[PDB]
């Protein structure tokens, strides 16, 4: 009496190819060990916040996903559990994107996705990629007219996750590096090396004239409508604009100071609430949703590149101009920090941005202020 066997998982609510992929595999496994599996769509950033309170209420999901920056910070609060998969499983994935999914000698999840943002053109209006990032920027001022909605180029300046190649050029970082990246405290993201790339981010909006309190709608829109040659943006776009009609192409981002502009690297992956009732099987379904062939349709359907090694190796992966643009990024770019400070980073850094951007604050002042604040949230993550 009582046997209403039944998982949650919470995908990412992009209306579309994601969400669909998952109910795909889903309704799979369903059809396999005849556990009811419900995909419900919940917002990629908003999921680990619903955890937090829905999961201890028991209302939250058994398999949730969100980028692994964050994967400290939700170990430490007790949202994730560490999963029990063999050896084999393991195995079967990139090393770079099973230790974004490990903190504490512990791993928390299996990937699904390994990403970063590179050059993506319109091939209609731009032929050629710009050599250098002083070229590309001199062409972003040469052609954003925002006084008809055209764009040479156009990007979410107002972001960290996406100005983050213009900070470490000038040799700024998120966490000082010293042997290891478990770093206590030592946040360098007011150093006068990251002044230098908020001063990059202020002539976005000064002299390449980008429009104010700018968002990925507003980036995506205006390039799905043609009205932008060239953005900045990951893998996770490309559906979209093809279902455009935009004739997309993909470079890796030109060449900043003479060196390989250093782009964050992100890992999406399942993770297991603490709070999930059935442990067990909800891991028996993240191994089913993140097998090879599961995998393999996932790319086919949402563009995502799985980080699985055979996958990352075929032809349809490694071998497609489209893709292949975004895995060289990839391979000159840093995975983001996953110790648990990183869940303070984020909403004090992109107010800094929002402030230069709207004129408000210099760099100086709003990287400043910006430390200050992440320092103090920190003083309050502990017992
Ligand atoms: O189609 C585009 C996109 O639109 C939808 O997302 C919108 C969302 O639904 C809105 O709610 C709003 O989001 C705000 C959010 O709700 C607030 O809580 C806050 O967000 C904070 C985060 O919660 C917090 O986790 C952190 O976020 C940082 C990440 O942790 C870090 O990993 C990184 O994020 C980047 C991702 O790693 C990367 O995958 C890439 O994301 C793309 C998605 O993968 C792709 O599916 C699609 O997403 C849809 C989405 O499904 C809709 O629901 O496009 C994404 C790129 O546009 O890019 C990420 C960076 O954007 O960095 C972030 C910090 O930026 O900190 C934040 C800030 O405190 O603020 C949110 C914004 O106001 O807006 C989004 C529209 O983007």
């Given amino acids: 009496e009582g046997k209403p ?3 949650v998982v919470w995908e990412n609510a992009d209306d579309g190819v994601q969400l669909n992929n998952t109910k795909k595999w889903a309704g799979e496994f369903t059809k396999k060990t005849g556990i009811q599996v419900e995909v419900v769509p919940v917002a990629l950033l908003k999921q680990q916040e619903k955890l937090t309170l829905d999961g201890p209420a028991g209302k939250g999901a058994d398999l949730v996903t969100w980028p692994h920056d964050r ?26 994107a099973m230790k974004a999914l490990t903190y504490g000698g512990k791993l928390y999840g299996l990937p699904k996705a390994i990403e970063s943002v590179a050059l993506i053109y319109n091939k209609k209006l731009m032929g050629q990629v710009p050599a250098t990032y002083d070229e590309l920027f001199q062409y972003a001022k040469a052609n954003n007219k925002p006084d008809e909605q055209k764009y040479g180029v156009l990007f979410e300046a107002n972001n960290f996750y996406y100005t983050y190649f213009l900070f470490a050029a000038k040799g700024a970082a998120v966490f000082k590096e010293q042997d290891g990246t478990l770093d206590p405290n030592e946040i360098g993201l007011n150093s006068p090396e990251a002044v230098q790339g908020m001063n990059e981010v202020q002539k976005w909006f000064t002299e390449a004239r980008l429009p104010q309190s700018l968002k990925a709608d507003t980036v995506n829109g205006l390039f799905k409508s043609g009205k932008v040659a060239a953005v900045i943006n990951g893998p996770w776009a490309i559906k ?10 993909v470079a890796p981002l030109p060449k900043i100071d003479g060196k390989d502009a250093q782009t964050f690297i992100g890992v999406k992956g399942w993770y297991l609430s603490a ?9 028996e379904l993240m191994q089913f949703l993140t097998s090879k062939e599961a995998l393999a349709s996932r790319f086919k359907e949402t ?3 799985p980080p699985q090694k055979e996958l990352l190796n075929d032809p349809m992966i490694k071998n497609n ?7 060289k990024q990839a391979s000159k770019g840093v995975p983001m920090p996953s110790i648990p400070e990183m869940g ?12 230069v951007a709207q004129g408000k604050q210099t760099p100086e002042q709003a990287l400043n202020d910006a430390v200050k604040i992440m320092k103090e949230k920190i003083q309050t993550m502990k017992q």
């Fill in 5 to 7: 066997d039944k998982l």
């Fill in 71 to 96: 994967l400290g910070e939700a170990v430490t609060k007790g949202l994730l559990q560490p999963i029990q998969v063999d050896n084999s499983v393991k195995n079967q994935f990139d090393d770079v």
């Fill in 240 to 249: 979209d604009y093809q279902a455009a009609g935009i004739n997309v192409g």
């Fill in 275 to 283: 709070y999930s009732k059935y442990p067990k099987y909800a891991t």
């Fill in 303 to 305: 563009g995502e590149i």
């Fill in 321 to 327: 101009p489209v893709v292949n643009g975004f895995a």
């Fill in 344 to 355: 303070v980073v984020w909403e004090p850094i992109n107010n800094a941005h929002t402030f």
